[PDB]
Amino acid sequence: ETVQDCENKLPPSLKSRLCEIRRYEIIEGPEMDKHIHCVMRALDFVYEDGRGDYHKLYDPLNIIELDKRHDVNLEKCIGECVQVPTSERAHVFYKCLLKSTTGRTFKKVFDLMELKKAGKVPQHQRYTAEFVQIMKDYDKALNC
Numbered sequence: 001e002t003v004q005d006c007e008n009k010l011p012p013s014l015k016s017r018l019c020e021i022r023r024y025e026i027i028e029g030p031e032m033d034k035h036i037h038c039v040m041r042a043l044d045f046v047y048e049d050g051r052g053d054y055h056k057l058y059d060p061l062n063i064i065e066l067d068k069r070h071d072v073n074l075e076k077c078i079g080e081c082v083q084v085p086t087s088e089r090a091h092v093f094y095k096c097l098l099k100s101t102t103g104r105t106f107k108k109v110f111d112l113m114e115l116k117k118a119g120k121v122p123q124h125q126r127y128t129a130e131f132v133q134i135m136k137d138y139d140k141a142l143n144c
């Protein structure tokens with residue numbers, strides 16, 4: 001199940017807000033709890049119960065930009081998600097990550113790994129100016 005599959009099975013009320021969703025705007029609700037669990041699983045960033053996976057993010061985050069705060073932020077946000085209902089866990093992890101200083105590098109890792117799995121870039125693709133245009137053209141084709 002891909003990020004594209006997840007968005008296809010969005011309810012009308014959220015499909016109309018795809019573009020907000022895809023710029024990582026936070027939207028509350030049990031439907032968004034569901035969807036974010038879906039995408040976070042699709043890109044492999046969380047376990048089945050929705051707990052963030054430190055080891056899926058640490059190096060990729062530091063490789064994009066080296067920052068000791070990545071460690072701290074990962075531990076914090078795993079800290080948080082472990083304390084909430086499972087139905088909610090992935091979304092809390094993701095919300096916490098976005099609000100931390102790691103959020104901006106997280107979006108890049110996320111972007112790069114969506115596009116790597118979709119086959120649009122090579123596995124070793126870095127976050128370059130070309131990549132930003134590729135992701136722009138990728139979103140435009142989805143009406144975003």
Ligand SMILES: NC[C@@H](O)c1ccc(O)c(O)c1
Nearest residue numbers: 021022023024039110111114
């Ligand atoms: N361009 C953003 C895109 O990769 C994206 C981010 C977050 C999401 O929850 C999503 O469905 C898509």
